[PDB]
Amino acid sequence: MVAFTVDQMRSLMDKVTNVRNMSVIAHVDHGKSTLTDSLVQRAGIISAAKERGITIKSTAISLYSEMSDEDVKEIKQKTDGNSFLINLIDSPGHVDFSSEVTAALRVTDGALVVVDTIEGVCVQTETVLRQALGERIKPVVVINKVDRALLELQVSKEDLYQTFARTVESVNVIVSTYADEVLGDVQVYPARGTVAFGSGLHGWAFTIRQFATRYAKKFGVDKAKMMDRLWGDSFFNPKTKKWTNKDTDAEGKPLERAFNMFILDPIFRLFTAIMNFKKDEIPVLLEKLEIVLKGDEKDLEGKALLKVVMRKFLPAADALLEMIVLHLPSPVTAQAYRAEQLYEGPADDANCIAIKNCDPKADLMLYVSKMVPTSDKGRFYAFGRVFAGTVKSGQKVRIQGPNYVPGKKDDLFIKAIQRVVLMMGRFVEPIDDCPAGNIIGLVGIDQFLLKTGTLTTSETAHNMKVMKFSVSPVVQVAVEVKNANDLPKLVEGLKRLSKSDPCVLTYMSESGEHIVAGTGELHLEICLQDLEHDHAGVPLKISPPVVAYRETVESESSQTALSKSPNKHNRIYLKAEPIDEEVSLAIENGIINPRDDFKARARIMADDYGWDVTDARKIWCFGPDGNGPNLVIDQTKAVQYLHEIKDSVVAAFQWATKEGPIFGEEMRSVRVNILDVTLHADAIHRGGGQIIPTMRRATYAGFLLADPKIQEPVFLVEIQCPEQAVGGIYSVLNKKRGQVVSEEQRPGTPLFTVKAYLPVNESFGFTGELRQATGGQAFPQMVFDHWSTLGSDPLDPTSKAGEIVLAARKRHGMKEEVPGWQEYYDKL
Ligand SMILES: C=C1CO[C@@H]2[C@@H](C)O[C@@H](OC[C@@]34C[C@@H]5[C@H](C)[C@H](Cl)C[C@H]5[C@@]5(C=O)C[C@@H]3C=C(C(C)C)[C@@]45C(=O)O)C[C@@H]12
Ligand SMILES: Nc1nc2c(ncn2[C@@H]2O[C@H](COP(=O)(O)OP(=O)(O)O)[C@@H](O)[C@H]2O)c(=O)[nH]1
């Protein structure tokens, strides 16, 4: 549109009182693009001077505009000259709530909210506006698609007005409701020229002020008052030739409002005449309004003409530009009431002040809004705003991350800025510097600032409103080699991955699978990628990690269990019953140890865990692995060669409990009581290969008679997030048998710390699903917490648990049926 040299741009960048950092806030289909596009063609700036080339993803655009000596006097705000530099920063239309959006606005001071003439203000509209308000962004309105109502609906004039009327009122509800008391009445007033009406597709729009001036010069009145009248309850009676503050002429008759008589009328008459082909009235009407056509335009018809005559009548572009310049704040103005909020430090601090003043001579205070993709071979550029001091190419800056703390040296990076550039839509342009108050990009920060961050030149500097990260590994899957022979390389490469990525984690699952875990899904992504193509460079099959379970019993076996050796000579009679959870834990945590003296040990189980004191000294072993939470207590009476079979009964128990009868999982909280034992006179028939199997079977039998169940692992998740999104937590948690434990708020500033239990086998995907429910606001952090017995029957293929088992057996190539106890029991 207009081309400027790089110097010209720096000159404009010097008068920051004539700059406007804004964006366009709008609903999903309200003309946000046809409208900004309209502006761009009118005022868009372009690079002056104009296999190999460079490009960046559009993130901002620059518009230039000159005003009239008079229009610059209505600017109730420190100005400097007839010129202006508008910054049209792009914002995410459809992206989740608070992350992509919040960050973008933060570098804007004003907004241009687009509302629809028919649908009025919808949810999203009200949502982003509330968002913008939160950061104290002043709103200015534009009701769009006024053409739909004029054609399709055929609406009246007072009908339409009333619409505009409402739409304005709702917006003013949201305004007052979320506006900082200290900022004053930011409510939009059509009569004050802060609300524009028009059609972005047709190309026309208008503010009341534009009409209040048209009529102001001709008939000789000051517009101050002509504006107040041209909207609301002010009527002008042709007859009385005077105005009134009541909608009824003395005689009791209804009059026509000004807005309708002086604004809408002219318009309506033009539609109706050109849209009905009244080739005789068009000429006289156009003449009357002072709309001159040129050349072949004189012979247009219908829609073709409505657009020409309408765009000449009220160029959408000038209405928008008006409001922008005359009502939206400049940095100098906004950075004064927006300084505290954007600074996380002392509101009296040296820097926090250089923001308010928007002083380019203070200590650098540049905020990075986001990292933008570019054709420069995988390099990203930093897009942000210079809030204080000034940036320079090759400058030495202190890059502070989201965790950085003034004292502590974490997230801090004392590197230098390669180049400072202009982000002109899809193109960039190098410059020498950029003072406080502007929008610029930075090349060479890539690797030190992932996303949001603050750049400073002061060592006693604080960070600007920062965004929190997820830094614990949580996203994990099971990695395995496709050709068994590559195993050595998979292993080889897992130590390679770890040695390079300090934010990755690798380990062996209880169920023997190698495991890769990472920060986010994107992180795991890059990780598994490199692993298979460089670290290990071997084909791998990635999958959800297999969960381990615990086979346990619910009560004392309904009946005694019997089992005879394959000698038909020796028999064993036992029963199984549950061990208490507080106890099982004690065994697990080593408070009750099989290696500790019977002295200390006997004491603890009697004097601290209710165990009958005699019991303590008749346990033969804990298991599996000699020290697990399962006991074999000897309750026999007159077995001659008892002490003779002990060593065997033990090795049998250490086997049974390592791989239970349900599906081979480890048993937990299982206490086996041997009620009696009968042996053969000779030791030649009570050997190992005779007793071991007897006990193995015997135990299984008692076990299944004891109302079997299974225990599932359970995580203990911790979450941090803003008060509003604490809803998503409970939202998703419910869809996964979750359970909120505690909800504590960190004193100081909003950020809740939700804590809950999460069934390990309901956690695949959780991290992602969380991002959604909270629009990228919360970040999880898991850890194993405990075992929990499932209520359902493990031998009923259809029950919850029973499905868990079933699939398991199929995965192992075992029978789908779980051999009931009868299979192990040997009746007398
Ligand atoms: C989310 C994270 C981040 O890093 C942590 C790592 C260190 O520990 C992880 O905790 C991993 C656990 C730890 C416990 C206990 C050892 C008892 Cl025996 C039962 C096991 C589990 C088995 O079902 C239950 C948990 C989820 C698993 C696999 C599905 C991978 C487990 C495993 O096999 O290691 C949680 C991870
Ligand atoms: N009649 C009419 N259609 C419009 C107007 N503004 C936008 N549209 C149409 O609405 C649709 C969506 O508009 P667009 O600007 O892409 O919406 P966005 O999603 O807000 O960017 C398109 O088909 C446009 O042609 C307008 O003022 N009048």
Curated annotation (Swiss-Prot):
Recorded consequence of changing P566H: Causes impaired ribosomal translocation with an increased rate of -1 programmed ribosomal frameshift read-through during translation
UniProt cross-references to CDD domains, sorted A to Z: aeEF2_snRNP_like_IV (cd01681), eEF2_snRNP_like_C (cd04096), EF2 (cd01885), EF2_snRNP_III (cd16261), EF2_snRNP_like_II (cd03700)
Catalytic activity: GTP + H2O = GDP + phosphate + H(+)
Placement of covalent cross-link Glycyl lysine isopeptide (Lys-Gly) (interchain with G-Cter in ubiquitin): K827
Post-translational modification: (Microbial infection) Diphthamide can be ADP-ribosylated by diphtheria toxin and by Pseudomonas exotoxin A, thus abolishing its function.
Modification type Phosphothreonine: residues: T699, T749
Effect listed in the UniProt record for changing H685N: Leads to conditional growth defects, sensitivity to translation inhibitors, and decreased translation
In-chain residues carrying the UniProt-annotated modification N6-methyllysine: K495, K599
EC number: 3.6.5.-
Keyword Zinc-finger attached: no
Keyword rRNA-binding belongs to the record: yes
Positions with a binding annotation for GTP: 26-33, 144-147, 199-201
Main location class: cytoplasm
Positions of modified residues (N6,N6-dimethyllysine): K495, K599
Impact upon substituting V760F: Causes resistance to sordarin
Activation/inhibition comment: Inhibited by fusidic acid and sordarin, which prevent the release of eEF2 from the ribosome after the translocation step. While fusidic acid acts on all eukaryotic eEF2, sordarin specifically binds and inhibits only selected fungal eEF2.
One Gene Ontology MF term: GTP binding
Record domain tr-type G: where: 17-332
Pathway: Protein biosynthesis; polypeptide chain elongation
Enzyme class: hydrolase
Protein family according to the UniProt entry: Belongs to the TRAFAC class translation factor GTPase superfamily. Classic translation factor GTPase family. EF-G/EF-2 subfamily.
Description of how the protein assembles with itself and partners: Binds to 80S ribosomes. Actively translating ribosomes show mutually exclusive binding of eIF5a (HYP2 or ANB1) and EFT1/eEF2. Interacts with the 40S ribosomal subunit protein RPL9A; the interaction is direct. Interacts with the 60S ribosomal subunit proteins RPL12A; the interaction is direct. Interacts with RPS23A; the interaction is direct. Interacts with 18S rRNA; the interaction is direct. Interacts with 25S rRNA; the interaction is direct. Interacts with RPL0. Interacts with STM1; promoting ribosome inactivation.
Protein name: Elongation factor 2
Species of provenance: Saccharomyces cerevisiae (strain ATCC 204508 / S288c) (Baker's yeast)
Gene that this polypeptide is encoded by: EFT1
